[PDB]
Every structure is written in C-alpha cells, then in structure tokens.
Design a binder for this molecule. Sequence first.
Ligand SMILES: C[C@@H]1NC(=O)N[C@@H]1CCCCCC(=O)O
Ligand SMILES: [Ca+2]
Length: 587
Amino acid sequence: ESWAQSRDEQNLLQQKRIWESPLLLAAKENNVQALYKLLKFEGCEVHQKGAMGETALHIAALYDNNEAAQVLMEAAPELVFEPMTSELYEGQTALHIAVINQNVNLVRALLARGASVSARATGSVFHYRPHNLIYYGEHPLSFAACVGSEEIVRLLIEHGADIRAQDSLGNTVLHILILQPNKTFACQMYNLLLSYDGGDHLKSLELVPNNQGLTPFKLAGVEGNIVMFQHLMQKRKHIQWTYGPLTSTLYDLTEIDSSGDDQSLLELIVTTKKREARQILDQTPVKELVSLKWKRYGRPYFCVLGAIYVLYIICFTMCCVYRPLKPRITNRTNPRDNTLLQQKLLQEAYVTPKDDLRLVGELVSIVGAVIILLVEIPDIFQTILGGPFHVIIVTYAFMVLVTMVMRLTNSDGEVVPMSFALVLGWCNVMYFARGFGDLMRFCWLMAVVILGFASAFYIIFQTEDPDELGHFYDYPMALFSTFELFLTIIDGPANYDVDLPFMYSITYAAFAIIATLLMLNLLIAMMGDTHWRVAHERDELWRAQVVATTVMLERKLPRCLWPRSGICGREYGLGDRWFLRVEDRQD
Ligand SMILES: C[C@@H]1NC(=O)N[C@@H]1CCCCCC(=O)O
Ligand SMILES: [Ca+2]
C-alpha cells in the first residue's frame, strides 16, 4: 500500500463521507434551501468533520459556492478559525482554499470575520516534493502571489499579512515565486511584493536567505530561472553613461563571486545536478566574468601546471622503463614450459653506476604523489564536469604509493600497481586538452593514449621472451606497435603455446575499448560539426567544462596569484564590493 494509494483511497473516501452526510453534500451541491432546512430544524452538528477533517465550510470553499458558504458563516461563525485536522491537509483553513480559487468575495468576507492570515498549512500535500504537483508554501499570502492574483496579494497585506513569513524550509514568499512555471507573470508579482518592504537598508527581504543559505537572487541562478535572473539583475546594475549606441554599465558582482565557502554562485552552478543552471553562465553579467578569469590567469596557470604535470609523468615513466633488471635465477623455466619468464626483481639497487639517476627520479615520483594527495584528499566533498581528472589523479598516487609499498617488501608482482599508474597518469594528460577544437583534440587525445598504453605494454613484456610475441621488445617498438594496434591494422598480440601475463589481457581489454570509442567519437565529431546547431550543445558543454576548471584553479591557488575579478570600490568610493565594468553596443 503505497502512500499514493492512500490519498487515492482518501480522496475516494472523502467523496463517500460527503455523499453520506447530507450537510456536506449540500455544501458541495450549493443547496441553500437544504442548508436552512438541514440546520435550523434538527440540524446535524455544524462542527461536523469529514474524511479529511474538513468543515462544512471547507467543502463550501473548495467548490466555489459563495451562497452556501455564506449560510455556514452566518449560522456558525466559529468555523472560519477551524483548520483541517487530517494529516494530509493539516493546518489548511477555509481562507487558504478561497485564495487558491481566487474567490475574491469569499476572501473579502473571510477577512471581515478576522480569519488569521498567519495560518500555516503544514499538511503533507503542501510539502515541496516531486509527487506534489504544486508547491505554494504554507501561508495564504504566499498562495495569492503564486496564483497571480495581485488583488488578493495587496488585500491580504492590508489585513497585516507578513511578507517576511518563512515556511518549514525557510523559504520566503520571494523564494517560492522563483519556483514557478509562469516566470514572466511572477516577475510582475515579484515587484509588487517588494514595494511593501519597509524601505530600510537593513533587513531587506531580498537579503533574507533560504535555510540552505540561499538568497532569492542566488536561488534563481541555481534553479536556472533566466527570466527572474535577468529581472533581478536590473536592481544590481548601474549605467555609467550613454555614448550613442555604446552603453557602459556597472554590475554589482557581489553574490556572483567568491569570498564565500559555498556562497559562490559559480560554485553552486558547476556543482549542481541541474542541467538547466548551465545557461545562467551565459547571462551577460556572468559570461564576461568567467571569460576574463580564463583569458588571463586561468589559461596560463592551466598550461603552466599542464607542462609541470606532463613533465612529472614522463619522469615517472622514465623510471619505470629502465627499472631494476635481474636474470631468471631459477631453473623453473623448464617446468611449466609455457612460461616465457625472465623475471627481474632484485634488491641490489643501492649500487649506482647509473641507478641514482633513477633514484632521484623515483624520489620525485613519491614526493609528487604525496603532494597530489596533499591537495586532493583534504578536498573531500563531488561532481565531475570538466572530467574525472580528480578521481584518476588520486588513484594514480595510490598506485605509486602501493608500488612503493610493494618495494622493500620485494613482492614479485611489482608490475601490477606500477602498470595502473602509467595508464592512469598518462590518461589524465588528455584532460589537459581543453586549452582546432575539431579533430586536433582527438589527435592529441590519441597520442596520449598510446604513450599511456605502449609504455604500459612495454613494462609487461619487458620480462617475457621477445622471440614469441615480440611486439614490444623495444620502447620505440612498443610505441609503434601500440600505435598501429590503435587502428586495428595489426592483429592483437596473441600467442597461445605460451602463457601470457594476466596484465596484458587486462590492459588490452581496457585499451581495445578506448581505442574504439575515440575512433567512434572522432567519426561522429566529423559529422556533428556539419550536422546541426547541436555543435552549440557540444560547444556549451566544453565552455561549461572550461568554467568548471577555472573555478577549480581559484580554490587552491593562493591570494598572491590570481587577483580578484573586477575593481574594488573603496575609494573611488562606491563599495566594500567589487564591480565589473561592461560596455555593450546596440544595433
Ligand atoms: C481537493 C481536496 N479537498 C479538500 O478539501 N482539500 C483538498 C485540496 C487538494 C489540493 C492538493 C494540493 C497538492 O497537490 O498538494
Ligand atoms: Ca589480421
């Protein structure tokens, strides 16, 4: 018995109780001659409750029967105060119902009887849930603003309706208006509510935050309401001058930027699972902001950090390709004849004819792996948009450390964690391709993959006998052999009289999948560019990835680098805030 079945049972049950009781039916049927005949002579108790704990007036308010409802208030004035006692509709009054249906004459009569406008409808159907078709809040004033009845809104205000009222979720009337379908109607209704504010610079209602720490303006950007977002921007932009077509306007740039841990409107847009919020980044106050942060200080640092990480990876592979080597000391090669093994694990690495040159490189691969963990592990909680680069980088350092833990214990399978570090470390270089967009990305994407897998394949078959399956006997041969395996020109390295290492079968399955996807993705990329304006859907995704990466770099970089966006106002003399100067042309 699901919860949706119960309300279906109750709604069917409610009609039964209305059908059974002749008083509830006459209120539903608007039978005035009955109500006097029902009530004045042997009247069933007027405080009668239905299946939902509704009063006879509550039923008279649902079906806009003003005349039947008027009989119920004159014969019994106490019914106006009574709220619905059922669990589903707990707190709702006859005033809430009359406001929804915009029955103005009944609303006017209900305030004449002093119906409390502070009545909170805390019922279950009024909860902000996906199984509820409408969310209007808990106050009758909030109901008036949502139905768009400006007449009821000011009328409710006249009788002392508090516009600062917050529901169970801490949402004000303004927060609720942004969560509405008809955005262009709510824009008119939104300005109506603001005029009734006290006008104090303090305690402004637009500053009252959601319980999740969201002002109405900030919530509009998170929710993706462009109409409200463009609307709420008029208050916070200032036009400096008008020079013919040119117009230099100054934007506030206060709740849109960063000195808040999660108060950044950018961080909220890039971390939310709302795909609709991706379009707020293209709005004219924001699109210039993110573009300036990327042009300078976003692009160079990404490339500066890019060359460092690239150099860090090749250095690590340089230690892997020329790692310790030992002959097959055991005569075990004859038993289990399938083995082509010349295993090469030794502990005489301290001797340094050229080994220290690897030791200092191995030390770099460790101090860089912990530095990698020193900047991503304290950065706990998680949304990937620019790529799963953060998921792969920590697993890489995990492998290097595990490979380091594998060392000194002299475990034979040192290749296993070391091979995972090669693919994971190199494939993260292809994430740097964001900084010729068509084809050339795959061109650099494909080059990284072989260097990540050819170098891996070389490590696995560095031990085995190159006479059988000698596809990667040389590192320049591992590169070329894996390069042509990328295009299926060469049949996959296979020999069945011997037993191959299990890392090859694992690495090849992972290589075969990627090689096909990139070749599959390349072909569509060629069509999708000349297919339709879907290229813009493919374009704005990358532009969002660039913005997501730009916000990523600004978190950990210190304050000495990457100065604050815009220009401060404290002398010139207009703000503790930072303003962005934008000028546009009109035609
Ligand atoms: C029609 C029912 N009868 C009644 O007296 N109140 C109910 C009103 C139904 C509104 C449900 C709003 C929602 O979906 O949350
Ligand atoms: Ca073949």
